[PDB]
Design a protein around this ligand. Structure first.
Ligand SMILES: *[C@@H]1O[C@H](CO)[C@@H](O[C@@H]2O[C@H](CO)[C@@H](O[C@@H]3O[C@H](CO[C@H]4O[C@H](CO)[C@@H](O)[C@H](O[C@H]5O[C@H](CO)[C@@H](O)[C@H](O)[C@@H]5O)[C@@H]4O)[C@@H](O)[C@H](O[C@H]4O[C@H](CO)[C@@H](O)[C@H](O)[C@@H]4O[C@H]4O[C@H](CO)[C@@H](O)[C@H](O)[C@@H]4O)[C@@H]3O)[C@H](O)[C@H]2NC(C)=O)[C@H](O)[C@H]1NC(C)=O
Ligand SMILES: *[C@@H]1O[C@H](CO)[C@@H](O[C@@H]2O[C@H](CO)[C@@H](O[C@@H]3O[C@H](CO[C@H]4O[C@H](CO)[C@@H](O)[C@H](O[C@H]5O[C@H](CO)[C@@H](O)[C@H](O)[C@@H]5O)[C@@H]4O)[C@@H](O)[C@H](O[C@H]4O[C@H](CO)[C@@H](O)[C@H](O)[C@@H]4O[C@H]4O[C@H](CO)[C@@H](O)[C@H](O)[C@@H]4O)[C@@H]3O)[C@H](O)[C@H]2NC(C)=O)[C@H](O)[C@H]1NC(C)=O
Ligand SMILES: *[C@@H]1O[C@H](CO)[C@@H](O[C@@H]2O[C@H](CO)[C@@H](O[C@@H]3O[C@H](CO[C@H]4O[C@H](CO)[C@@H](O)[C@H](O[C@H]5O[C@H](CO)[C@@H](O)[C@H](O)[C@@H]5O)[C@@H]4O)[C@@H](O)[C@H](O[C@H]4O[C@H](CO)[C@@H](O)[C@H](O)[C@@H]4O)[C@@H]3O)[C@H](O)[C@H]2NC(C)=O)[C@H](O)[C@H]1NC(C)=O
Ligand SMILES: *[C@@H]1O[C@H](CO)[C@@H](O[C@@H]2O[C@H](CO)[C@@H](O[C@@H]3O[C@H](CO)[C@@H](O)[C@H](O)[C@@H]3O)[C@H](O)[C@H]2NC(C)=O)[C@H](O)[C@H]1NC(C)=O
Ligand SMILES: *[C@@H]1O[C@H](CO)[C@@H](O[C@@H]2O[C@H](CO)[C@@H](O)[C@H](O)[C@H]2NC(C)=O)[C@H](O)[C@H]1NC(C)=O
Ligand SMILES: *[C@@H]1O[C@H](CO)[C@@H](O[C@@H]2O[C@H](CO)[C@@H](O)[C@H](O)[C@H]2NC(C)=O)[C@H](O)[C@H]1NC(C)=O
Ligand SMILES: C[C@@H]1CN(c2ccc(C#N)c3ncccc23)C[C@H](C(=O)N[C@H]2CNC[C@H]2F)O1
Ligand SMILES: C[C@@H]1CN(c2ccc(C#N)c3ncccc23)C[C@H](C(=O)N[C@H]2CNC[C@H]2F)O1
Ligand SMILES: *[C@@H]1O[C@H](CO)[C@@H](O)[C@H](O)[C@H]1NC(C)=O
Ligand SMILES: *[C@@H]1O[C@H](CO)[C@@H](O)[C@H](O)[C@H]1NC(C)=O
Ligand SMILES: *[C@@H]1O[C@H](CO)[C@@H](O)[C@H](O)[C@H]1NC(C)=O
Ligand SMILES: *[C@@H]1O[C@H](CO)[C@@H](O)[C@H](O)[C@H]1NC(C)=O
Ligand SMILES: *[C@@H]1O[C@H](CO)[C@@H](O)[C@H](O)[C@H]1NC(C)=O
Ligand SMILES: *[C@@H]1O[C@H](CO)[C@@H](O)[C@H](O)[C@H]1NC(C)=O
Ligand SMILES: *[C@@H]1O[C@H](CO)[C@@H](O)[C@H](O)[C@H]1NC(C)=O
Ligand SMILES: *[C@@H]1O[C@H](CO)[C@@H](O)[C@H](O)[C@H]1NC(C)=O
Ligand SMILES: *[C@@H]1O[C@H](CO)[C@@H](O)[C@H](O)[C@H]1NC(C)=O
Ligand SMILES: *[C@@H]1O[C@H](CO)[C@@H](O)[C@H](O)[C@H]1NC(C)=O
Ligand SMILES: *[C@@H]1O[C@H](CO)[C@@H](O)[C@H](O)[C@H]1NC(C)=O
Lengths: 750, 749
């Protein structure tokens, strides 16, 4: 670690981190060692020939977000210097023009979120070895520019260009004279309404094309959005893509398509993913004209093609959907329909490869759960945000994808265990006794936020006893009855976060006895169940359990139990490694209670409590403990003799406490501490009296910079490997002459 | 000037409000005219004959909740002085016995929430004159007491007792030897499992009986709740109520009743109100035994009687329901069923007096709204907490079982026929959503995640809507047509609306508001409005109130083209304006001068103001209330007497004020009420508020100030004692801060 840039080594290339250090010029310490430089989130506004000299070993400069609040001054040839400069990022800098005078060694140039309106030869016709060029957000509702002007041939010379991102800019036409070497052409939100034959004449190599937000369909647009001539459509000629033989991805989101010409995929048997969401294509879904041309598609998205004023009975799926033999996921979010039958999805049932169906936000009230058994390999069923009821009787970031969320539908940690079903945000206020009948073998089940008030008695998941991951978060479930969920003999993950039932009985209040007949349950989350009361004893004997979260409960109220009934409330869980006691409003954990914790614990969090006094001396029973998180507490003091107490602990987060005095016998035991966190306490000074540590957090402590402090800065220098995060945020409170400056940029003994 | 009690005139005598003054003992500082003394919610730990010597004239004493944060120590006859004592409340005092020297003249005695496990004749029986007696929560799960020991017939020579409350007291027998004069008897949650025949005899006079919470059914109980043996209901002998001819009120809420012995009501021609929520009577609802013994019943609650596991297809309503001819209110919550069709409700359509139909929490999937026309006196239809879809092509003095709040906001109910459709699944407004409804005047569509794009044709089917509640939805109204099919509309509530159609340059269009000639209120709180897109003049001759909090005026008035100066000047009639929570720091001078001069209340509390230009108030002749609480104001003005003569109330608590100017208000002065609490005042140098003529000022609040009480304060504390016509509230919150020997209480010291 040198000041002002924390330094670390990756590969045979030294990287320098000077981001968010608030500096106003190119730093000084940066040795010729450095090869990739990071300068983002600063207050720099000047870049000269002198800024970058001597460093010639540099291949890269980050430099985005400068200054942070005219723009940022770049001098003709301030970079012409370095013959190693590969990548050069300059996003969000308020640049008026394209840096005049630039290195040829440049491969990947970024220039987005600036004020470049002229695109000129004088700027970029020299960077031949340019590969990836980004230029989104440059004439995007600035009104000091009608069109992003591009001068002819500004792309025909950059013969090594693979990627061009002109998305989110104001062009009316498609830039002529591009290089045939192109592979990705991003042009979203560019205001193109006419697409010619010529526009894409001879990019025979192009793989991805992105034409969204052209004539948008402003459902929930996270940015300025303006529709075409009423319900007007982006107008695409049939021979627009004749040449585009090599092509995997097509994103035609928000174009307001009504009719899909099927002449477009005539010469393109390649295409792997089609995005046709936020359009008007209900007719085309039903009359699948193009649906014939796509045998190698694996993912299809037709989401938010719903018609205003409409709520059909059923969803009209063309037969031409059985020509989609390669499909692996289908995305049908927000058609909006009332009932799904076996019939309606008939065309998809003889599709061999289809493994995800996405039906969320379709506000559907009834589905035949049988119809899902006629699939040959499905393990994702997403039905979130529909109106399924209890069943009775019947046996900002531009680097992102705006039109298609890339987060997993289900949690991987769940989609692991087998077939995943998501019934979250539905109307299942209790569990109908027919709720699960005709369901495939379910491994992963989400019932999140159904305000489900079901008394559980162990009957309810009988149709599906083979569940592993079950998520019941945000519900009003009762499980005072000990038979509760016990049908689920294979269950490993129970997520019961935030549950208040409606059947409090006195002396039955909370009854966890039901945990004990699990032979296989590993993760148990009971956060925010507001338990202040057990009628099950303190013995919860289970060797299955590894991790228990017990946040948002009332541990205090239990441990003030006047007859002392609640001491070993966790002893029985012998195999517990991780435990979580945060937000239980704890003041004094009685000594005998703390000593009755699984001797097996690896992590222990008692943070965001009200803790005053910690009896450190009790850490001797916990010899596997690697992490102790005591953050957000009212702790004053630290044991002078940590030696006596532990030799297993690796991480000790203490921040947001009221620690004034850091004692003398720190590092008295082989403390195994690589990571020590003391930031946001009440430290005036660190004495002299106080090599295995790589991290120390001190930021935001009232430092008293008097020379009395200078012992510490000698230690910060003898021991130079131990990194301090945001050094520049460890500051002087005092004295007056000092208040504001960093401990490190401090002229000492004067 | 009274200390410490605020001393009000009421009817013909003097109240003393000494409640909640951190008081530790009764002051002998209260007057002699006082007949009523509230000493509630204080820290008093003792009571003796020296406590209340001086005022034999007292009739009522409060005392409740003393002390706070041990017990209350009453000696034998601390009240035997008080010859004029009618009332005496003593609830929440950790009392170990019944006080032992009370006067006869007691005719109302409340001793709830104490620690009296036994009732002795030494204490009460010699109190012949009592009329009311409340004894709830005394043996209420102590682990000390199994039983609320009642001396056999302790109540026998209480021959005037009208109201006896014994609720929430573990005694499984109805005490014997009761007084005949009893009209009202409460026995809720007493663990009385069996009601004999001899239990109620001699109570010819009884009009109310309370027996709920015995053999409870524990749905949502907000206290300890313990079911009887297995699923066992209460047991009441056939001839229990043989003698109770005069009974009007009968609570059997949560008794677990499967079966209603229609023989209980043989002698009760009179019964008006029947509470039977929280039992298991789906069947007794299907086939009404009792339903015929009740001609004169006006109110019937059978809420939360559903069967668990079950979600039937229809509700089953005995035709035995048109024998309740008197019926005014019917409550049917938590039957839970899928569908109400016309014929299911045929038996109720032949009732003259029925106005309130309560169908809350039935999770109803669909309804034939036609059925509602076929009702004569229908006013409130309550359909909250159902499942309707878009149609296409702690307190012990309370009622625990019944919700006694208005089902519908009265302001709404006033206009007439009310339909509450809140907490349903109407995610947009179906083109057939209101076909075959009555003419509704008041409509609630709150909390339906309703995303409807409005075009002003969505409401054609019921176009006489005057009060429309649209809070907590996701409604677009950028179309100048939006809602215009509702010409008669008077109140529009759109709090908390965030749409999904943000087009740029249309953004937020507020043009639809120029249509209404009788729109009177409009609540636009919390819409995140920061972008508006029309010609300036919002033009509304009608509109009187605009709530505009939780928006971004700050953002709007910071416009560099000044496009939003005159954003509200077109609202000529407006007299109320709430501009709080806009995070405003500076209101531009021209932006303020373009508020309508008509305003009368202006609210800019809870923003971030530092400076306020008083001398603009001049353009505001009718202004009368100004509220700038929770801003950050520093400086006032020395000539405010010049810039406004209309202004009645000025509120400025929670600001950064320490200097009080040597002008202000004297002689040419601006009326009645001045709040200057939670400021930063050290001292006031009399130069503020001169004794020029007589300033009209009645009331002035200055509590929670950081006061400097050495000698400086000599001038004000004179001024106080001479302007007795100037009320300062809360003299026990006007504290010192400066002299470290004075920091606390004081000003009065
Ligand atoms: C009710 O309770 C349950 C249980 O308490 C809650 O769920 C648990 O929740 C935690 C918290 O989110 C989950 O942890 C997260 O899981 C992510 C995926 O993990 C796996 O994949 C990665 C890579 O594929 C592997 O490395 C992991 O394997 C490791 O194995 C063990 C753990 O078994 C570790 O000890 C090893 O060291 C290995 O790492 C997993 O198989 C994971 O991404 C995530 O990690 C980030 O966040 C944590 C902070 O919690 C950091 O410690 C960690 O360094 C990561 O942070 C960095 O980088 C990302 C980008 O990569 C940045 O965005 C971040 O800022 C960050 O710096 C974490 O481990 C856990 O899986 C889960 N358990 C269960 C039961 O599934 C419920 O949520 C709860 N209900 C609610 C909602 O209240
Ligand atoms: C979206 O915007 C709309 C527009 O504001 C909101 O609607 C307003 O909401 C307010 C605020 O809650 C409602 O006013 C409230 O109305 C109460 C009922 O009033 C009627 O009768 C009363 C008694 O029955 C009559 O006195 C009234 O007459 C008043 O009339 C003119 C007004 O027309 C006044 O100028 C007179 O002086 C009269 O007083 C009404 O006809 C009323 O109860 C209530 O006042 C209690 O409240 C206010 C606090 O704002 C005090 O001024 C007042 O002292 C009252 O309270 C003392 O009393 C109680 C128990 O009695 C203690 O428990 C309290 O602490 C308190 O100290 C208040 O007035 C208004 O009706 C309503 N407007 C409409 C169009 O319905 C919506 O809320 C809003 N939506 C939200 C949630 O976002
Ligand atoms: C089972 O069911 C039975 C009967 O159905 C329940 O018995 C009810 O118990 C509650 C206790 O919570 C009773 O409430 C209180 O009554 C007092 C006194 O009564 C009324 O007395 C006067 C004449 O009627 C008058 O002062 C009041 O009357 C009208 O007054 C105004 C008119 O200006 C009108 O607007 C009111 O609505 C009244 O109609 C008065 O109500 C009453 O004073 C109590 O309340 C209020 O005010 C005080 C302020 O000092 C405040 O602290 C309270 O919170 C409250 O706002 C209160 O309403 C109720 O009367 C009983 N019902 C009947 C019909 O007798 C029983 O509780 C149920 N069991 C259980 C355990 O749930
Ligand atoms: C239309 O869909 C096309 C294909 O979905 C979109 O291009 C995809 O775009 C995002 C770019 O933001 C890519 O994510 C970024 O990629 C780099 C390089 O692997 C990586 O560091 C990222 O973090 C992030 O993943 C994504 O790879 C890309 N997909 C492919 C496969 O080319 C585009 O989102 C669409 N248009 C709009 C406007 O949303
Ligand atoms: C089950 O459903 C809930 C609801 O969709 C999921 O929680 C969402 O989770 C994502 C990422 O974990 C969060 O960003 C959202 O805030 C959550 N939304 C809500 C409303 O809770 C959860 O991921 C699902 N769990 C499983 C087992 O996959
Ligand atoms: C319309 O329905 C909503 C939902 O019931 C009502 O608001 C509830 O109102 C009461 C009283 O103001 C509050 O205690 C609740 O917390 C409210 N909840 C919600 C969802 O806001 C509202 O009162 C009804 N409006 C009318 C016209 O009476
Ligand atoms: C896809 C549908 C479109 N919806 C609708 C809006 C307006 C309509 C009109 N006229 C309409 N007409 C018919 C059918 C649906 C309609 C709203 C709905 C929604 O509420 N979405 C939420 C879910 N949680 C996140 C957020 F995206 O999404
Ligand atoms: C009246 C219904 C009964 N409910 C039910 C719960 C569990 C059941 C099981 N097994 C059940 N089985 C059949 C029918 C209803 C059932 C719960 C539901 C509710 O959500 N209550 C909340 C709503 N607002 C506050 C509070 F009143 O109310
Ligand atoms: C990196 O390049 C610089 C510039 O030519 C050179 O002086 C230096 O020796 C190289 N780095 C090292 C120390 O290997
Ligand atoms: C592209 O289109 C032209 C049109 O004349 C065609 O002749 C040429 O061969 C095409 N190139 C391909 C498909 O590689
Ligand atoms: C594809 O199927 C649809 C509906 O089943 C039909 O409209 C269309 O003609 C089919 N396409 C062909 C036959 O090319
Ligand atoms: C708990 O659930 C079991 C299984 O359904 C049920 O039989 C039992 O009655 C319940 N509890 C008891 C002991 O009453
Ligand atoms: C486990 O499961 C059975 C249900 O078959 C139940 O009878 C038994 O009591 C359970 N044990 C518990 C609650 O630990
Ligand atoms: C019953 O009440 C009446 C008035 O309602 C009263 O006059 C009568 O004395 C009471 N009955 C007896 C005899 O106690
Ligand atoms: C009341 O009506 C019910 C249902 O229609 C019926 O079972 C019962 O016999 C009626 N009671 C009589 C006839 O008294
Ligand atoms: C219905 O209400 C009126 C209004 O007070 C009342 O006079 C009448 O007696 C009631 N009719 C019956 C007997 O139900
Ligand atoms: C409404 O029609 C019903 C038939 O369900 C009929 O019995 C009823 O009398 C009609 N309403 C009235 C009160 O006229
Ligand atoms: C607004 O509504 C009218 C009538 O329903 C319609 O003709 C007009 O085109 C609408 N469009 C908008 C959002 O301006
Ligand atoms: C304006 O509102 C006041 C009440 O606020 C009312 O008296 C008057 O009639 C209204 N006048 C007009 C012009 O609508």
């Amino acid at each position: 670690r040198s000041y002002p840039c924390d330094e670390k080594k990756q590969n045979d290339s030294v990287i320098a981190e000077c981001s968010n250090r608030r500096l106003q010029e190119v730093p000084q310490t940066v040795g010729k060692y450095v090869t990739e430089l990071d300068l983002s989130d600063n207050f720099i506004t000047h870049i000269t020939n002198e800024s970058f000299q001597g460093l010639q070993n540099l291949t890269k400069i980050n430099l985005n977000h400068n200054p942070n609040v005219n723009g940022l001054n770049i001098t003709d040839g301030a970079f012409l210097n370095l013959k190693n400069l590969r990548e050069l990022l300059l996003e969000d800098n308020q640049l008026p023009q394209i840096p005049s005078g630039l290195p040829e060694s440049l491969t990947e140039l970024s220039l987005i979120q600036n004020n470049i309106y002229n695109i000129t030869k004088e700027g970029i016709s020299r960077l031949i070895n340019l590969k990836n060029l980004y230029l989104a957000w440059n004439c995007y509702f600035n009104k000091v520019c009608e069109k992003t002007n591009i001068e002819d041939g500004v792309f025909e010379t950059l013969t090594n260009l693979e990627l061009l991102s002109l998305s989110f800019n104001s062009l009316s036409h498609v830039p002529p004279k591009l290089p045939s070497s192109l592979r990705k052409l991003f042009l979203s939100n560019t205001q193109i309404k006419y697409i010619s034959e010529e526009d894409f004449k001879g990019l025979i190599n192009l793989t991805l094309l992105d034409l969204s937000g052209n004539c948008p369909r402003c459902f929930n647009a996270p940015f300025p959005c303006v529709p075409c001539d009423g319900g007007a459509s982006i107008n695409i000629d049939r021979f627009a893509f004749q040449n585009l033989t090599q092509l995997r991805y097509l994103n035609l989101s928000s174009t307001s398509l009504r009719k899909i010409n099927a002449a477009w995929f005539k010469n393109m048997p390649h295409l792997k993913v089609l995005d046709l969401e936020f359009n008007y294509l209900v007719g085309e879904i039903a009359s699948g004209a193009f649906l014939t041309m796509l045998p190698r598609l694996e993912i299809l998205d037709l989401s938010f093609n719903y018609i205003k004023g409409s709520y059909p009975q059923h969803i009209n799926i063309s037969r031409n959907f059985s020509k989609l033999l390669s499909l692996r996921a289908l995305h049908l979010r927000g058609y909006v329909f009332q009932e799904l039958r076996e019939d309606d999805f008939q065309p998809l049932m003889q599709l061999p490869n289809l493994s995800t169906i996405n039906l969320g936000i379709n506000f559907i009230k009834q589905i035949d759960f049988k119809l899902f058994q006629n699939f040959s390999n499905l393990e994702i069923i997403y039905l979130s945000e529909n109106r399924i009821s209890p069943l009775v009787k019947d046996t900002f970031d531009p680097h992102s994808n705006f039109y298609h969320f890339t987060r997993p539908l289900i949690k991987p940690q769940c989609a692991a265990y087998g077939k995943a079903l998501d019934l979250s945000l539905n109307s299942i206020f209790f569990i109908g006794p027919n709720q699960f009948e005709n369901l495939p073998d379910i491994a992963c089940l989400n019932l999140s936020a159904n305000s489900n008030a079901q008394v559980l008695s162990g009957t309810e998941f009988s149709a599906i006893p083979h569940v592993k991951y079950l998520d019941l978060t945000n519900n009003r479930l009762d499980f005072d009855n000990a038979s509760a969920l016990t049908e689920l003999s294979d269950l490993e993950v129970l997520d019961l976060s935030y549950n208040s039932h409606y059947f409090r009985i006195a002396g039955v209040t909370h009854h966890l006895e039901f945990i004990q007949n699990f032979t296989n349950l590993k993760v148990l989350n009971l956060s925010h169940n507001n338990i202040y009361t057990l009628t099950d004893k303190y013995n919860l004997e289970s060797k299955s359990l590894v991790e228990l979260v017990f946040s948002g409960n009332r541990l205090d109220i239990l441990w003030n139990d006047d007859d002392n009934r609640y001491i070993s409330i966790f002893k029985g869980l012998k195999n517990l490694t991780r435990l979580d006691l945060s937000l239980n409003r704890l003041k004094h954990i009685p000594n005998e209670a703390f000593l009755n914790l699984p001797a097996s614990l690896t992590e222990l969090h008692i943070n965001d409590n009200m803790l005053k006094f910690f009896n450190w001396t009790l850490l001797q029973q916990f010899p596997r403990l690697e992490l102790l998180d005591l953050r957000g507490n009212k702790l004053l003091f630290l044991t002078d003799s940590l030696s006596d107490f532990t030799s297993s602990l690796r991480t000790l987060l203490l921040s947001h406490n009221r620690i004034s005095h850091l004692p003398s016998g720190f590092l008295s035991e082989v403390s195994s501490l690589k990571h020590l966190d003391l930031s946001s306490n009440l430290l005036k000074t660190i004495n002299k009296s106080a090599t295995k540590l790589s991290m120390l957090e001190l930021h935001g402590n009232p430092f008293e910079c008097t020379c009395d402090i200078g012992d510490f800065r000698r230690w910060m220098d003898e021991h130079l490997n131990v990194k301090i995060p945001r050094l520049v945020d460890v500051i002087c409170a005092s004295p007056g002459d000092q208040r504001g400056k960093s401990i490190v940029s401090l002229e000492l003994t004067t």
